[PDB]
Each structure stands twice: as C-alpha cells, then as structure tokens.
Design an enzyme around this catalytic site. Structure first.
Site, PDB file in Angstrom:
ATOM      1  N   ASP A 153      33.161  33.720  27.236  1.00  0.00           N
ATOM      2  CA  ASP A 153      33.821  34.663  26.570  1.00  0.00           C
ATOM      3  C   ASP A 153      32.453  36.305  26.236  1.00  0.00           C
ATOM      4  O   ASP A 153      33.598  37.075  25.791  1.00  0.00           O
ATOM      5  CB  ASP A 153      34.502  33.920  25.046  1.00  0.00           C
ATOM      6  CG  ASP A 153      35.377  33.619  25.516  1.00  0.00           C
ATOM      7  OD1 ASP A 153      36.205  33.263  26.563  1.00  0.00           O
ATOM      8  OD2 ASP A 153      35.521  32.136  24.709  1.00  0.00           O
TER       9      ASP A 153
ATOM     10  N   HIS B   2      27.007  27.588  23.025  1.00  0.00           N
ATOM     11  CA  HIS B   2      28.533  26.818  23.117  1.00  0.00           C
ATOM     12  C   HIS B   2      27.656  24.949  22.532  1.00  0.00           C
ATOM     13  O   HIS B   2      27.363  24.587  23.172  1.00  0.00           O
ATOM     14  CB  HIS B   2      28.215  26.915  24.856  1.00  0.00           C
ATOM     15  CG  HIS B   2      29.759  26.507  25.323  1.00  0.00           C
ATOM     16  ND1 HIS B   2      30.097  24.786  25.840  1.00  0.00           N
ATOM     17  CD2 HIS B   2      31.398  26.931  25.444  1.00  0.00           C
ATOM     18  CE1 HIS B   2      31.575  25.033  25.998  1.00  0.00           C
ATOM     19  NE2 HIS B   2      32.027  25.970  25.508  1.00  0.00           N
TER      20      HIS B   2
END
Ligand code: OAA
Ligand code: OAA
Lengths: 426, 426, 106
Positions: A362, A305
């Site tokens: 996700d 991320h």
C-alpha cells in the site's frame, strides 16, 4: 507427514483425535468430535483454531509467499490482467480463450446500475466520506436486486456474483464523482476493466478522455495485487455473515466496512492527517514529521505488516510500477520527494529497522494513486472494490462447503440465577 | 469441575492444558497459546470451540433456561419493561429510579432521525421489502452520524449505542409507512417506547390515535422477549464484524441482514405464504400443508428450535399475552382462530411430536402481530429492532475484552505453487 | 422530426410513478397530463390549434412509449435522433444504452 498419524486428549477420559495436513502449511488436529464427547476448547479470537479448509489462497508469512490457486502473486501481477485473475480466483484454473471470452462478455454485460439505485447517491451529503457512501449503496442493493437473494440456490450465487463483480467499479467511481460535484460517467464496453474505471473516475462531458496505457496498466496491477488476501478481518466477516444466511450483497457490504474499520479507528485516523499534511521537505526529511510517532498507525500509512515477516511479496511489482508511473507523469513531482525520503527513513532508521516498519504494498499503491490525482479518501474504496472478487470466492467456498451455520460457544461468567424486582415505578 | 480435572494433549510429549469453569454451564479447556507452539486444532462449524467469555445472557438448552444478567426471562417479561431491560443488558444491573429516569431521558431525546436520511428513504423503490430498506438505511448511518465511529473511543461508543437504541424504532416504523404510502410519523416524547412505536406505525394525520393499553403491553413484551439471545449466528456476525473495528452502524446492519438471512429462499416465503394467505380452519391444514411443505417449511412458521430441547422459555408469557390480545380485540382476532388448530396440530400430530416442532415464541409473537394489524413483512424488522440492544451489549462486551480480533486460520488443500502460463488474450 | 422531444418537466413526471407500475398505466398517465404543459393548443375550435396538437402527439408518442419501457426496467432515457427512421428511432430509444452505440437491424 509423520505424526500426522493421530494423537489423543484426556482429562477424565480417553479421546483419539486425528492429525490432518494441508497441501501446504502445518498440520491441524481434527477436534470435530470433542464437542459430542462433551469437551470444549477456549480460544478467544480463533488464533490457535482453524475455522475452515480452503483451496483459494495460500500465504506463508514468515517466507513472504502469496499464492492464488497455486499461482505466485508476482507472475499474475506482471503476466495476467485483473479480469483473468478474477476468473482464476473464482474458477480455480487459468481460462481458455473461449472461457475468458464469455467471462468478459457476461461481466461487460451488466456494469450499469439501475437508475433508481443511482437516485440513492443523491440522498447522501456531498460532504460524506466516499467510503461510507460505498458501504451505504452496497448495503442497499438488496432492495433493488431482490431476485438473487437465496444463497441456497446455485444460480442465485452465480448471478449475485456477476452483479457485484461488474458493478463495484461503476459504484466506486460514482462515489468519487458525487464527492467532487461532477456528473456520473456510464460504463463503456470498448475499454478495459482498468481503462474503464479510470474513464469513469476522470472523464467529463467537456472533452473526450484519453487513458494513458501506462497509468492504465498501473491501475490493473493495483487491482490484481488486491484481489484477495487469504483469511483476515474483512474476509472472516464476509464468511461469518455468509454462513448466517445473509444475502450476498449484505455480505460484501459488511466486508467493505470491516476493511474500512482500522481507518476511522482513532489514533490511526489522526496520524493519517499528519502524513497527508505535514510535508514541506523540512519535516519529513529531517525526521521532523516522523519525530512524532506516539500513535504508530504504520501499516495505515503503508509501513510494516501483520503477516509477512520481512517484506510484502506484493510490494515488488508495485514499487517498479510506481517508479514507472512517476516517470510517465514526468516532472510535476516536487512535493513527492517525501516519497523517496520516507522509503529511505523506513529502510535506514534503526527504529524502523528494529520494529520493521518496512514499506508494504500500500505504500507504493498510495504513491501511485496520489500521483494520479486520486484523493486519499478513495484509497480504501478502490482496495475494497478490488478485494470484492476475493470476498466472492471465499463466500462461494463457504457455501459450497457444507452450509453449517457456525454457532460458537461462550464461557458464561456472569451472574447465577437471581430473582428480579424493579426499583422503579415509572 | 466434574468430568474434567486437568487435561493432557498427547502427540509425542504430554501437553497439560488448564481447564476453565464458568459461573454456569460447561467447563472448558484452555488452548490460547497452543498455536504459539505450532499446535492448532481444526474445527469448521465451531462444534467444540468456545469463541468468547460473556456475562450477558445464559442459556441451558436442555433445561429451557434463559437469563439476562442473571434474571429469568419469565420474570423480566412479566414485571419489567423494554427500557429497564435495555438498561440491565447494557449496564449489568437493574437501575435505580434515578439511573432509569436518566437513561430514559437520554433515549427519548435522540429518537428523531436526520431529515437528510428521510430523502434516502424516498429513493428506495415503493415495492422494496421493509427488511431490505431497514438494511439499506442502517448501513447508511455511518455516512451521516459520522461523529461517533471511533470504536476504541469510549465516548463515541456510548453515543453510538444510544443513537441506535433511540432511532431503530423510528426507522422501523418509517419502513412500514413507506411500504404502504402513508406519511412518516415523528416520535412522541410523552409516549412510552412501545406506545410510541405503535403510534409511529399506525397513527395518521386524519385523526388522533389511541394507544390501547393491552396492545401497548403486548408489544413491550414482544420486545422484551426478543431483546437478546446469547451467542447466535446474527450476534456472531456483529461480534466478528466489530472485531475488525467496523463502525457501530455497519455491525448492526450486518446483524439485521444476518437475522433476515434464513428467510430469502423460495420455499421460505412459499411456506410462510399459506400460513397467512389463508384464513379458514379446514384449508391450510386439512390434508393440505401436511406435505405441501417442502424444504424447511416448519422452522420458518414458529415450530421447533435448535437451542431449546423441549420448549421455548420465551413462549410461556408470550402465549399468555396472546390470549389477552385476542380477547381484547375480539373483532380483530376471532376470524383468526385457525391458530388453535395449528397449535393443536403441533401438540398431537405424530409428525410434529416426531420432529419436536413445538410452537416457539415466534408462533405466539406472530399471532399478536397478525392481530394488531401488522403485515408479515414487518415481523423480522420488529424482531431485529428489539434485538439491537442485545447486539449492542455484545458488541460493547467484545470491545471490553479489547476488541477481540476474530481472524481464524485455514487448512490449505489447494494447489501447491505452480507456474502461470497465459497463452490467451482479451 | 422537429418536435419529438418532450419538455424536460414532463420528463420529471415519470419519476413520480412507481418503477413497478404497468407501462400502459404510465402511458395513459403521462398522455393525460400533457395539457398541463401544452396549454397553448387546447382550443379545439381553432384550426391552427388542432394542427399543432396533432403534430405534438404524432411526434412525441414514441418518445413517450420508449420512456415508459426504460423507466420500467431501470435504464436511462434515450433522446430522439433525427438521423434515424421513425421505426429505427423507436427501436433505438427502446434498446440503446450509453455503454455502446446501438445498431438497428434493417
Ligand atoms: O492482514 C491481511 O491479510 C490483510 C491485508 O494485508 C490486506 O487486506 O491487504
Ligand atoms: O437460533 C437462535 O439461537 C437465534 C434465535 O432464536 C433468535 O435470534 O431469537
């Protein structure tokens, strides 16, 4: 809170600039005057420049913290429901019962989309990506809802908001149904926001569809966990289009495309195939499929991320939700051993350890949706669908600010004035 | 480097920042790395922040200077044509007869729109505003021309840029036709850009259409004068959307919606209502729309401009052309000599001399369009159509700078973390 | 109650009108086109003919009027229901949506 007093700048003359501070996060140096003085900074990308003041979401990436109106993302995920999170995001406070009752009635009131807008879908190819159909339809709403386009009118915003809010799921489920050749399913008032979505996504007229409370709550969580994420590419896009006067529907349409951007981005896009394809418990396990990793496209597959240093705070609730669902859908999960295997390689491989390609929210959202029979092409659609409330809040906050049409400057480096004489005679 | 040698950011320890200079315009202060030192500036409105470095268009507001790749707008609008100008904006230099003929050849062979898209046109309501349909169609392009959405692949980017340059005129004309219920007209490979667009706008199967030479030139000039306008709001939206990796069509659609933007309000068309709703000297002005104008009601009719100080360099030749058109048509203008009084008002009325509400290029552009028989609901569609090449050039440049990811930061002033306690239900 | 439904093709006619048209003009338009779909009961010299033509107009006018309204506001058409009254059925076709069973106030 000390040096927040003030500070100055000077190249040829003296300028005194204040040091502002937030309720959380570091200070900023108000240079809102250097402009007049005749001084201009150079920051391609706005990395060292603060473009706005916000009271919506707070993120401390290094510390893995995410707050929506002060409320920690973890509590909202397990304790709230998407609609309530919507209210909080748009209003700034948890809703009283009566307040939430009305909010829910208004929403439920306009979930249907004008039958003519529905005719628009039939003009797309059945083979089109459902995300492109999603941007297409959302970008056409203005031709059907021309009465709520003046962003200078408060009632206007009020209405435009409820329209996007109530209709995005009806729209997303239609994209899916059109992509697989099944008839559209109307919105039902007797169902939850999540239950209704699942219903519109999966029910056929050949038998009454029954929503599994487990999968439902799982969807509700997928939604809350994507409601908003502070400033970023798609939200900055929604903020810029907004302050340029663009109608609300167009603003969301640009937001959806910005969100899709990384995906049909190339190297990214091709590694997307490698995952969704190669997976015969010989490739993924023995680091065969992962033996190929020139193109990273990691966060795209749910790894690593950009903001959060060591972990995505939103991934905690989702991983547990993922565990739950995988068990509720019982033993029909063979190929989905790569799920358990990839997480293992993400936490145990020195490379991933070093480069920190840790499973983000996700990764698990993807595992959940897959286990549900939802195709990958519909992943960004559902995220954009959920992120819409956040875009509305930011857009509504950009307006209420001071409606100061932002006009960045450019450092002209081109040709100085030169006379023109064509070399053509055609 | 005049009133700016070097600068020092003062907090508690002098921080020297390198000053940068453009080939034209103001010098700036570098601050790219500041953030990398916990030091951020605050500047909502971007009143002091230079978002990018560009070589496309140069403007000097106080001097009324407008250049495209170094050439004076006046020179280009008089001795060039739209395509040659597109080549310049896109390529940075004027073309050779060979480069130009190659460029022209590529453009004309992509002018036709896919037949499936024609079906999408027929799904929009007949009373849809041309600009809304234009937004609806452009944002839907990515679903079809899906072989050119990889923004980081130079082959895809040129193919997209060319598709847009070729098809916009086609789509714009179809927006008009559809609104009036006349059949769509196909491009004419043998006609010039401007002549082809006039034919697609006004020809009919009933008989052959004759492209008036003076009107053909008037339109090409209008196009030239709206090709690009440096770092404005709509261009900012395009660049910002493009930074996220959004596909080419989505960005241009965002630009179109952005250009339409400041024209949705009630007093917006309510003002630009009587501007044409009445065609008789002593009526619109004569002790009427003196105060009958309420919110903007000035800046929307082609009076004044926040970029230029005294006059609009684009209006010069546009005013010249205006004469030629009224002169030429005669029986398609004369009634319309309410303009001279409008212009006269703006030149001597103490209220206008006061607000510097001087007639801009859109005042004269509108007269020509109102004279050619074009409805006011097509004016911005035409402006946007012409501006696309500029939007395309800026999009490309930003991508040449390596897809400058425009993701500003925020100053958070909302709640500090607080517990979430929900006692309500659903 | 037997013939309240209108031939699906006649129903296709509505979609060829503008959504912005006056519902009264759409009403005259559709009624004036019925002959192109019901060509078997046009001889006014035949008594059975009149008998049939009558029941057709009588049963179908409300279905038609409610469709004009639904088309004018963008909602889907509602089929005639045999379990309702002539008036109840009209209200139903005028106001019900598929998003919730509609209940007619006596
Ligand atoms: O980088 C961000 O803040 C955006 C993000 O993760 C998301 O959209 O889920
Ligand atoms: O106001 C601006 O700078 C933008 C403008 O005039 C145009 O797009 O023609």
């Amino acid at each position: 809170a000390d040096t927040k007093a003030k500070l100055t700048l000077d190249g040829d003359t003296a300028v005194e600039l204040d040091v502002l501070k937030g309720t959380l996060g570091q200070d900023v140096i108000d240079i809102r005057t250097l402009g007049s003085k005749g001084v201009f900074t150079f920051d391609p990308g706005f990395t060292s420049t603060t473009s706005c003041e916000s009271k919506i979401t707070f993120i401390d990436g290094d510390e893995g913290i995410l707050l929506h109106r002060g409320f920690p993302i973890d509590q909202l995920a397990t304790d709230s429901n998407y609609l309530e999170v919507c209210y909080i995001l748009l209003n700034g406070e948890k809703p009283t019962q009566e307040q939430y009752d009305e909010f829910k009635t208004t929403v439920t009131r306009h979930t249907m989309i004008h039958e003519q807008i529905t005719r628009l879908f039939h003009a797309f190819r059945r083979d089109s990506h459902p995300m492109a159909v999603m941007c297409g339809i959302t970008g056409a709403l203005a031709a059907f809802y021309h009465d709520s386009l003046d962003v200078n009118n408060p009632r206007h915003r009020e209405i435009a908001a409820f329209r996007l809010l109530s209709k995005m799921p009806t729209m997303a489920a239609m994209c899916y149904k059109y992509s697989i050749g099944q008839p559209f399913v109307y919105p039902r008032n007797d169902l939850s926001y999540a239950g209704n979505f699942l219903n519109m996504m999966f029910s056929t007229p050949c038998e009454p569809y029954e929503v599994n409370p487990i999968l439902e709550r799982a969807m509700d969580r997928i939604l809350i966990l994507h409601a908003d994420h502070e400033q970023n590419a798609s939200t900055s896009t929604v903020r810029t289009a907004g302050s340029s006067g663009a109608n609300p529907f167009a603003c969301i349409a640009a937001g959806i495309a910005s969100l899709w951007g990384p995906a049909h981005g190339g190297a990214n896009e091709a590694a997307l195939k490698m995952l969704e394809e190669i997976g015969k418990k010989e490739n993924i396990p023995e680091f065969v499929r992962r033996a190929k990793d020139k193109n990273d496209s990691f966060r795209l597959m749910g790894f690593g991320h950009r903001v959060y240093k060591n972990y995505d705070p939103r991934a905690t609730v989702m991983r547990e939700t993922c565990h739950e669902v995988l068990k509720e859908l019982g033993t029909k999960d063979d190929l989905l051993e790569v799920a358990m295997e990839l997480e293992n390689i993400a936490l145990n491989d020195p490379y991933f350890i070093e480069k920190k390609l840790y499973p983000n929210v996700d990764f698990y959202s993807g595992i959940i949706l897959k286990a549900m029979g939802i195709p990958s092409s519909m992943f960004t659609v559902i995220f954009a669908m959920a992120r819409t409330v956040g875009w509305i809040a930011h857009w509504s906050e950009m307006h209420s600010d001071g409606m100061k049409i932002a006009r960045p400057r450019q450092l002209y480096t081109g040709y100085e004035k030169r006379d023109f004489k064509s070399d053509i005679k055609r």
